[PDB]
């Protein structure tokens, strides 16, 4: 078929600031069975309809996977603004694919706080659609120059999630898969 188990059932997910990008091509994909039988927390399609994705064919498909905050799943959508949309993962206003998310508090959570997932807190400007910033360096606040080390107005642009089982659904980790849309057919 098509390697969707390698995306949705991956043992580990990337952080939102360094989201993965898997190119899907030369496969037959049954979107209908995935939508109908897999119980995700969210399955929203914007430019297409989930129930009729099989009759469509695309030259290439991208699958982006990352882990974000519970109430940050709101801004994985066209036209949304916020921390994630501006600085971590911007989605085009004419996005045509689908956004899939599910709660992963049973895996990405630790009693001592899981710091393995980072998100970009500070940036000079908003992200372009489907672009990422892997390189991390000290951000200048105010007007004073920075020497390359954190200080009074010099911050590490990467802030760590601290997922714990008792944070509640607002702060619990959510694994998000974004599918972007004639070698791929249903």
């Amino acid at each position: 078929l098509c390697p969707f188990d390698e995306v949705f059932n991956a043992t580990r997910f990337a952080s939102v600031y360094a989201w993965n990008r898997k190119r899907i091509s030369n496969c037959v994909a049954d979107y209908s069975v995935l939508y109908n039988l897999a119980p995700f927390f969210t399955f929203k399609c914007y430019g297409v309809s989930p129930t009729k994705l099989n009759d469509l064919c695309f030259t290439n498909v991208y699958a982006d996977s990352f882990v974000i905050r519970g109430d940050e799943v709101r801004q994985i959508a066209p036209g949304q603004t916020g921390n994630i949309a501006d600085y971590n993962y911007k989605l085009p206003d004419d996005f045509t694919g689908c956004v899939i998310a599910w709660n992963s508090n049973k895996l990405d959570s630790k009693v001592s706080g899981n710091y393995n997932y980072l998100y970009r807190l500070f940036r000079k400007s908003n992200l372009k659609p489907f672009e990422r910033d892997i390189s991390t360096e000290i951000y200048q606040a105010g007007n004073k120059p920075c020497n390359g080390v954190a200080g009074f107005n010099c911050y590490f642009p990467l802030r760590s999630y601290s997922f714990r089982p008792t944070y509640g659904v607002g702060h619990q980790p959510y694994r998000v898969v974004v599918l972007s849309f004639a070698t791929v057919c249903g």
Partner: antibody
Amino acid sequence: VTLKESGPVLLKPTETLTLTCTVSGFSLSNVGMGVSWIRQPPGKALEWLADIFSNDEKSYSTSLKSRLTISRDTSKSQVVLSMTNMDPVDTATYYCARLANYDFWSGYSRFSAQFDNWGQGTLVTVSS
Amino acid sequence: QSVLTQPPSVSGAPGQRVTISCTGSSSNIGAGYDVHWYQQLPGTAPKLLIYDNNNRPSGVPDRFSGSKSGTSASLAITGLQAEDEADYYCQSFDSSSLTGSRVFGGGTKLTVL
């Protein structure tokens, strides 16, 4: 889509209530929709009580989580709500609603789901 | 008491605009969650009226509209007919708990003068 609750009942204080909601027009195994319970005291505001979804994922009111219990039976399309240690205050009209997304053509999102279909409600009286 | 708060009652003259407000906490409305509005005519079950921020189901006249701004949401009715005399309930998803919650407004009684 039609949701129907069990008939009105009368209970003594500290009794345990069991309410059954029978659904039609949709299957409880559908991933895009769930069934929830909402109660309204006479001449008061609505209050959400419990929640159940396609994969046995269940949610309850924070203040009433200890007393509430919900379950489903896909073999007969029924959802059951149980409340223990009923007080005379808990008398109200109990509604069975469907937590599904309108604009279902665009997919589903459990964060933005709404009670798009409601039952007619049943009246539960707790008194001596 | 309810997490979401609404004015106890609003009034307006026939054919005149009326607005019902709904404000939330840092969670629910303040956390970017959508707001839905329900209309409950006397002696009847609530009816979905606005299923998302400024989204409207079929069969609802275009004189009903909604909006969201920050930690607050509003429902506006352009005209005012006789049938617009019910209770209007604000609803949202509250994420300040382990399994989540769904919070209703206090209910607003609209009267047509």
